[PDB]
CSV table of C-alpha atoms (C1' of nucleotides) in Angstrom, one decimal:
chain,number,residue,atom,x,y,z
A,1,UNK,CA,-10.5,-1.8,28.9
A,2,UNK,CA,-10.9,1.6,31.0
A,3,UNK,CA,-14.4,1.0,31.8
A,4,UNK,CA,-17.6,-1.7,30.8
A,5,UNK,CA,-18.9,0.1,28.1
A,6,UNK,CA,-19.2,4.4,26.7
A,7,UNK,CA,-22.2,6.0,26.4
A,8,UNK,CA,-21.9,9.7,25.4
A,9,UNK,CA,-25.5,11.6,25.0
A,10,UNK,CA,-26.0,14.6,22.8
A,11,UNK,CA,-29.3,16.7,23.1
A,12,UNK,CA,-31.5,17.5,19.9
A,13,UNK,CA,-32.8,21.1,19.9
A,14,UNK,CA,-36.7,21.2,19.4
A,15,UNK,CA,-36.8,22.4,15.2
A,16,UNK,CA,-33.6,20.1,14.7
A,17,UNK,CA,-34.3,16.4,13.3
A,18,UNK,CA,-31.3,14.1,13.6
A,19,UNK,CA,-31.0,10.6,11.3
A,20,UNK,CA,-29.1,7.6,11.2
A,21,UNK,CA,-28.3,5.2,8.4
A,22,UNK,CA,-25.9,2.9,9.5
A,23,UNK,CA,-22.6,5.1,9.8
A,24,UNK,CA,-24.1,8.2,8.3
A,25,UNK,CA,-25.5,10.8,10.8
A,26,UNK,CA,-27.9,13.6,8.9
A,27,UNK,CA,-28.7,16.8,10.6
A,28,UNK,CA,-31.5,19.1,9.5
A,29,UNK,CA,-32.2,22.3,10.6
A,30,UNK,CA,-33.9,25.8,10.3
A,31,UNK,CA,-30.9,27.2,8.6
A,32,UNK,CA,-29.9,24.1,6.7
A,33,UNK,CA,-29.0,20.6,6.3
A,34,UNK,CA,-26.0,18.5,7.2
A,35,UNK,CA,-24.3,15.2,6.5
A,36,UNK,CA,-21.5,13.6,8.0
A,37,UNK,CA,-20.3,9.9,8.6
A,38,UNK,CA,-18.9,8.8,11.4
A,39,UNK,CA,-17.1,5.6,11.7
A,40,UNK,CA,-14.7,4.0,14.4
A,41,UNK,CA,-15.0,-0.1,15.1
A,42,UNK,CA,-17.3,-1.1,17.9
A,43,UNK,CA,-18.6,2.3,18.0
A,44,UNK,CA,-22.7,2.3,17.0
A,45,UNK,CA,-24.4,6.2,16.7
A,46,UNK,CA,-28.5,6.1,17.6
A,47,UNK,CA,-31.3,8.1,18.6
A,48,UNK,CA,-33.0,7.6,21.8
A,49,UNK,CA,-36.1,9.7,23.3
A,50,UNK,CA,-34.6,13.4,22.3
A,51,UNK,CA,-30.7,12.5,22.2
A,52,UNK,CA,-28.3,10.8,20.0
A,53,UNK,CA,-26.2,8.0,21.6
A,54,UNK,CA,-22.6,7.1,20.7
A,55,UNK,CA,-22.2,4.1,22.6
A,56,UNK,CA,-19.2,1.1,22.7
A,57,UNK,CA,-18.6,-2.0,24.6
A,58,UNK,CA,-15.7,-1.9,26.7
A,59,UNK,CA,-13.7,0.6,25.6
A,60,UNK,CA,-9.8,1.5,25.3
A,61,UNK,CA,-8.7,5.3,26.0
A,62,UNK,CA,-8.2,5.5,22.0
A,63,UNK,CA,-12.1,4.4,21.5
A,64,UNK,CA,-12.9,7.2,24.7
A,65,UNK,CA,-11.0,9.7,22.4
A,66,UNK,CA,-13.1,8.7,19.5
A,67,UNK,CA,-16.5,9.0,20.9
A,68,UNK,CA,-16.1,12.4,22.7
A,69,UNK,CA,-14.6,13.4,19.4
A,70,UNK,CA,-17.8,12.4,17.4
A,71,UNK,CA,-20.0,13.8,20.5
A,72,UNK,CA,-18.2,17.3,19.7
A,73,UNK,CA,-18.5,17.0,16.0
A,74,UNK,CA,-22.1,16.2,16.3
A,75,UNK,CA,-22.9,19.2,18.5
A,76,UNK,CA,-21.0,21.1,16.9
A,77,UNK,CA,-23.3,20.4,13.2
A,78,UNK,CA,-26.3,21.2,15.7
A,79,UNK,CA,-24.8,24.6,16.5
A,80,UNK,CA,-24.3,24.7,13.0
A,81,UNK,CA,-27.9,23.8,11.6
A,82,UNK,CA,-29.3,25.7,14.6
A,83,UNK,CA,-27.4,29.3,14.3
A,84,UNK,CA,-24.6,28.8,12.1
A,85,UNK,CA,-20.9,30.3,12.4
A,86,UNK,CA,-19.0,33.4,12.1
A,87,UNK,CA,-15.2,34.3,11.7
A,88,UNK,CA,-13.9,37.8,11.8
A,89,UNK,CA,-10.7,39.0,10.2
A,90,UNK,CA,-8.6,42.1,10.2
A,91,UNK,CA,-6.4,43.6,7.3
B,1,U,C1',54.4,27.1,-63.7
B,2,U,C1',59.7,24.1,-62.7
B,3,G,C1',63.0,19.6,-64.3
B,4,U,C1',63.1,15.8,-67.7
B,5,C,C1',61.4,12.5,-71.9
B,6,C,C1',58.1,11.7,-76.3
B,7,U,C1',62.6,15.7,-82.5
B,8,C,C1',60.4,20.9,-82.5
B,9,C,C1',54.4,23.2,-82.7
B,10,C,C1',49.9,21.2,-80.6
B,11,G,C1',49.1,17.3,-77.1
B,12,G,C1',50.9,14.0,-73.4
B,13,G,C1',54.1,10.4,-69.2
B,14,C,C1',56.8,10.9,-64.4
B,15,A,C1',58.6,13.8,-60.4
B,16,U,C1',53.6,13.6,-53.0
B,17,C,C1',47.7,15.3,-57.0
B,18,G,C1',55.3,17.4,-59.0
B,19,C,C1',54.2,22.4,-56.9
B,20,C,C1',50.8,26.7,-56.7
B,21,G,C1',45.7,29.4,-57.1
B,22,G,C1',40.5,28.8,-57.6
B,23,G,C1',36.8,25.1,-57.2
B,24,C,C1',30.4,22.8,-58.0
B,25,A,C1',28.1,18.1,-56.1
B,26,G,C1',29.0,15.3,-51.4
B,27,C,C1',30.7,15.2,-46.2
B,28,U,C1',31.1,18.6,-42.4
B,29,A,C1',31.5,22.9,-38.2
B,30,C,C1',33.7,27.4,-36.9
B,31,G,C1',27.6,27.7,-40.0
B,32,C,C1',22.0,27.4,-39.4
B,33,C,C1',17.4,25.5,-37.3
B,34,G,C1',14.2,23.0,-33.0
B,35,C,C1',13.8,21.4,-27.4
B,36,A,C1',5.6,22.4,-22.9
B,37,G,C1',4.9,24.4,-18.3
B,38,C,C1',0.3,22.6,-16.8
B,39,C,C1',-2.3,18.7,-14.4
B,40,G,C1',-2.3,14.6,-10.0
B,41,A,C1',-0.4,12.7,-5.4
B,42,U,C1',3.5,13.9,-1.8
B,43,A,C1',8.6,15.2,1.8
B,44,A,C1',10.2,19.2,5.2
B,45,G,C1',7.0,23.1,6.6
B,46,G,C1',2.4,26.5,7.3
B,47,C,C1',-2.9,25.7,8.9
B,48,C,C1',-8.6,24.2,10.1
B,49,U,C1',-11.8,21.1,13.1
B,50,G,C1',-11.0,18.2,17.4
B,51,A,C1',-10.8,14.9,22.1
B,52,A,C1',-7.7,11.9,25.1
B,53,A,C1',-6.9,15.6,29.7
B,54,G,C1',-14.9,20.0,30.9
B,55,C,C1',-9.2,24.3,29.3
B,56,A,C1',-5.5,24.2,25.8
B,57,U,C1',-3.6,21.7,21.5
B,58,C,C1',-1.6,20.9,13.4
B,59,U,C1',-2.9,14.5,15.5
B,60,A,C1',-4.9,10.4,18.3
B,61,A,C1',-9.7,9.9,14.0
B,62,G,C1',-10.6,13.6,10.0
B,63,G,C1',-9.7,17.9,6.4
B,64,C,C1',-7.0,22.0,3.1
B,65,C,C1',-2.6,23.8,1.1
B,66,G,C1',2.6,22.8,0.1
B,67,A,C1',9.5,21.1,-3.7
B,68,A,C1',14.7,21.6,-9.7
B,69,G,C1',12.0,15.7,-6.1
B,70,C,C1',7.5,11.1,-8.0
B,71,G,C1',3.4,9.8,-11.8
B,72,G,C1',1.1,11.9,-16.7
B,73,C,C1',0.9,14.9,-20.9
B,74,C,C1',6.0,14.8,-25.0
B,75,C,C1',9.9,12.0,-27.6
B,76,C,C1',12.6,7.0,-29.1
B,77,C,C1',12.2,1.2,-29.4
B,78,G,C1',8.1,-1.8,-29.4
B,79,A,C1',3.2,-8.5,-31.7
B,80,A,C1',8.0,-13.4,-28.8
RNA sequence: UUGUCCUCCCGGGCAUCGCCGGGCAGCUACGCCGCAGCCGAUAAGGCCUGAAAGCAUCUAAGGCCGAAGCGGCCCCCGAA
């Protein structure tokens, strides 16, 4: 193990209400709604206070991969809910 | 139509079906008719999102495409 145990925090915006159901994570915001599941072994997904918590009990470096990688895709569907995305392209 | 024999005519036997020309049915080819490009998952390869490694990154998790090649549609055998 690289450490005791992982905890990675991600901020919820004000209008944006995050969900749990076992390895689902729903996001709903202004512009929309979201649903994604997340799973990895050992790895449990929460909400705490105004934050949702990816947390694991002595991780590996694979399982510290993993988590940042579902703390970025998490923030990522808050961007999303909360603004939304936009690609340019030229001809 | 040739040689021979049945005496000659007619009509017949044998000589490779005696030889030659044509020849329907049948069998044949040199003759004629018929033989789908769509769906699904992939290899090489081209990409999206994405951390390990505050950046970057097609890869570690995940996702979309992508072969006369693989599976199905099709054909033949098939209740021991």
């Amino acid at each position: 193990p690289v450490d005791a145990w992982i905890r990675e925090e991600v901020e919820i915006p004000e209008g944006v209400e995050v969900t749990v159901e076992g390895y689902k994570v729903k996001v709903k915001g202004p512009k929309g709604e979201l649903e994604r599941e997340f799973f990895w072994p050992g790895i449990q997904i929460f909400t705490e206070d105004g934050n949702v918590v990816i947390y694991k009990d002595f991780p590996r470096r694979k399982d510290v991969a993993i988590a940042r990688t579902f703390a970025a895709h998490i923030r990522n569907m808050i961007k999303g809910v909360t603004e939304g995305f936009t690609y340019k392209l030229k001809v």
